[PDB]
Amino acid sequence: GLFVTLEGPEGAGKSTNRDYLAERLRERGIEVQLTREPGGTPLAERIRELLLAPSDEPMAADTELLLMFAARAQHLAGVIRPALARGAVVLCDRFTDATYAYQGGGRGLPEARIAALESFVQGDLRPDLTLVFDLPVRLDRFEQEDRRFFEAVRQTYLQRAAQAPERYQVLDAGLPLAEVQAGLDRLLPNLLER
Ligand SMILES: Cn1c(=O)[nH]c2ncc(-c3cccc(C(N)=O)c3)cc21
Q: Which atom of ligand 1 is nearest to the CA of 96?
A: 4
Which residues have C-beta atoms less than 6 Å from ligand 1? Answer: 9-10, 37-38, 68, 94, 98-99, 102-103, 142-143
Nearest-CA residue for ligand 1 atom 9 is 98
C-alpha distance across the termini of the chain, in Å = 9
In 2-145, DSSP assigns E strands to 2-7, 32-36, 89-93, 129-134
Cis before 82? omega within 30: no
Give the technique used to solve this structure. X-ray
Report whether 71 contacts 80 (CB < 8 A): no
Please give the tally of structural domains in the chain: 1
Report whether 108 contacts 29 (CB < 8 A): no
Residues with Cβ within 8 Å of 54's Cβ and at least 6 positions away in sequence, in order, are 138, 139, 140, 141, 144
Check the annotation: does 14 bind a ligand.
yes
CATH of residue 136's domain is: 3.40.50.300
Of 142, 153, 157, the residue with max ligand 1 atoms within 8 A of its CB, to mutate for a pocket test, comes to 142
Query: Is 144 strand, coil or helix?
Result: coil
Task: Say how many Å lie between the CA of residue 28 and the centre of ligand 1.
Answer: 31
Nearest-CA residue for ligand 1 atom 13 is 142
- Which domain range does residue 163 map to? 1-194
Nearest-CA residue for ligand 1 atom 10 is 142
Q: 113: left (phi > 0), else alpha (psi -120 to 50), else beta?
A: alpha
Of 5, 68, 102, the residue with max ligand 1 atoms within 8 A of its CB, to mutate for a pocket test, comes to 102
DSSP assigned state of 168: E
Query: Is 137 strand, coil or helix?
Result: coil
